[PDB]
Design a protein around this ligand. Structure first.
Ligand SMILES: [Cl-]
Ligand SMILES: [Cl-]
Length: 162
């Protein structure tokens, strides 16, 4: 298992524009297009991202390509974030994958605001961090996914994904 496989499970794969859990236009493997409520605005963002007139549909290859870019960006975003970097540097490989997933879902800004959980993670207080992570809108809105990422942080294993 690895980050890509993990996010593919959490996000799924759709070849046509769809709305995410927040009702935002998305495509592929969790690639957010726009927070705007206009489909045309989304179709436009999509053609711009793919470099062709798509008409709201892409192929698997195109989806995988946005995916690669998106995971690379998340990683690089963590590494450039003064709050996130040190936490990421302190973790083992499995747990790093969990921090990446959260950033992919919520943006680095969102994650950087889990001040207290970050500190617990950094200090390697697994059970406490899990508890704190759960007192969040994140957990209440997407509880099954959240439980998976939280167990990952708690255990350091991929069991929640098996
Ligand atoms: Cl893009
Ligand atoms: Cl969920």
């Amino acid at each position: 298992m690895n980050i890509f496989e993990m996010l593919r499970i959490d996000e799924g794969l759709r070849l046509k524009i769809y709305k995410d859990t927040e009702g935002y236009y998305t495509i592929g493997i969790g690639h957010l297009l726009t927070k705007s409520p206009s489909l045309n605005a989304a179709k436009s963002e999509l053609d711009k991202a793919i470099g062709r007139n798509t008409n709201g549909v892409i192929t698997k290859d195109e989806a995988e390509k946005l995916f690669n870019q998106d995971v690379d960006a998340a990683v690089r975003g963590i590494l450039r974030n003064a709050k996130l970097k040190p936490v990421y540097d302190s973790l083992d490989a499995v747990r790093r994958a969990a921090l990446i997933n959260m950033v992919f879902q919520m943006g680095e800004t969102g994650v950087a605001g889990f001040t207290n959980s970050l500190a617990m993670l950094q200090a390697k207080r697994w059970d406490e961090a899990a508890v704190n992570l759960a007192k969040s809108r994140w957990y209440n809105q997407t509880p099954n996914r959240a439980k998976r990422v939280i167990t990952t942080f708690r255990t350091g294993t991929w069991d929640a994904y098996k």
